[PDB]
């Protein structure tokens, strides 16, 4: 599934991401745009046996287990293919584990380099919510 920005925003707000640890909703939609380009089936192989999965590109060495990455910690305690769903619940619940405090969105390199410091609210203005 490739989401539209408003539809992803509404689904993210329903799963408790609006102002989660002080982060406004637009941050989360801007991160998904630059990480997966809003695709739930997005995958990225890295220069190490890790692969990043789904809408928020969650890493197979640390957060989900794919049974293929050397060293899997699996801290979200989830199989990586569960994150490739058109429903984003699993992906949001793991993201909430990753963001333990008000500086946790630095876990996504694209958010830090491309969203942080810009008008991320522009991604949700005019969406019904």
């Amino acid at each position, epitope marked *: 599934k490739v989401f539209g920005r408003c539809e992803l925003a509404a689904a993210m707000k329903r799963h408790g991401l609006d*102002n989660y640890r*002080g*982060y*406004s909703l637009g*941050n989360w939609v801007c991160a998904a745009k630059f990480e997966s380009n809003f695709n739930t089936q997005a995958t990225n192989r890295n220069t190490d046996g890790s692969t990043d999965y789904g809408i928020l590109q969650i890493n197979s060495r640390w957060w989900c287990n794919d049974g293929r990455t050397p060293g899997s910690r699996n801290l979200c305690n989830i199989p990586c293919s569960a994150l490739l769903s058109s429903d984003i619940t699993a992906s949001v619940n793991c993201a909430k584990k990753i963001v333990s405090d008000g500086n946790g969105m630095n876990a996504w390199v694209a958010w*830090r380099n491309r969203c*942080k*410091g*810009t*008008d*991320v*609210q522009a991604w949700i*203005r005019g969406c019904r919510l």
Partner: antibody
């Protein structure tokens, strides 16, 4: 330690253009916006404008034609330039860091009096 | 431009009273509203952002509420250091504007 400190001329005649500097420390200007706010003697706060981490600027509707904000990321400085000065521009001017739609750290302000 | 109407202009109160300050927006600001305290001769200090969230270090006797267009700051059992001015500010697109201010003074 996040610090913002304003420096300005103190007194100006209508024939001059105002330039005020905000020197920041403890954070990068690429990751945060800086807003400029003023407060006339014994009055409330007035928003003047801002410059985002990416360099885009947005201004108060009424004052946009007289204002210009810019920054030098390596010097860690933000500048407010104002021209066509009127005595109602007499105020304390403040720069404040914006972090995700709240102004969490504020400078002490500089007082400016506009003369004849 | 969305304008904010803040009231009252002044409140006289004793220590230990609860008081409420309101800001009404001329258009929906979608919860992007912040409150600041300004002590005599000091910089404004952030108290509350996104309508309800306390800034780090603000005591829990401050609470914010509101939705759409009317918003409130309530101060329960106010203390000697709470006297000063209070301002609301919205962050829905640009230009941003401030409420006119409320002076909280000793009774």
């Amino acid at each position: 330690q996040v610090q913002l400190q304003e420096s300005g001329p103190g007194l100006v005649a209508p024939s001059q253009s105002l330039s005020i500097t905000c020197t920041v420390s403890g954070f990068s200007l690429t990751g945060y916006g800086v807003n400029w706010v003023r407060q006339p003697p014994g009055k409330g706060l007035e928003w003047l404008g801002m410059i985002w981490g990416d360099g885009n600027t947005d201004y108060n509707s009424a004052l946009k034609s007289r204002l210009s904000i810019s920054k030098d990321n390596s010097k860690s400085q933000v500048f407010l330039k104002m021209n066509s000065l009127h005595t109602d521009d007499t105020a304390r001017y403040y720069c404040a860091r914006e972090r995700d739609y709240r102004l969490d750290y504020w400078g002490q302000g500089t007082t400016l009096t506009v003369s004849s | 431009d969305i304008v904010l109407t803040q009231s009252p202009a002044s409140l006289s109160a004793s220590v230990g009273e609860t008081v409420t300050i309101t800001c009404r927006a001329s258009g929906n600001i979608h919860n992007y509203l912040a409150w600041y305290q300004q002590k005599q001769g000091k910089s404004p200090q952030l108290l509350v952002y996104y309508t309800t969230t306390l800034a780090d270090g603000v005591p829990s006797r401050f609470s914010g509420s509101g939705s759409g267009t009317q918003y409130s700051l309530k101060i329960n059992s106010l203390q000697p250091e709470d006297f000063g001015s209070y301002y609301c500010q919205h962050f829905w697109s640009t230009p941003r504007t401030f409420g006119g201010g409320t002076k909280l003074e000793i009774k």
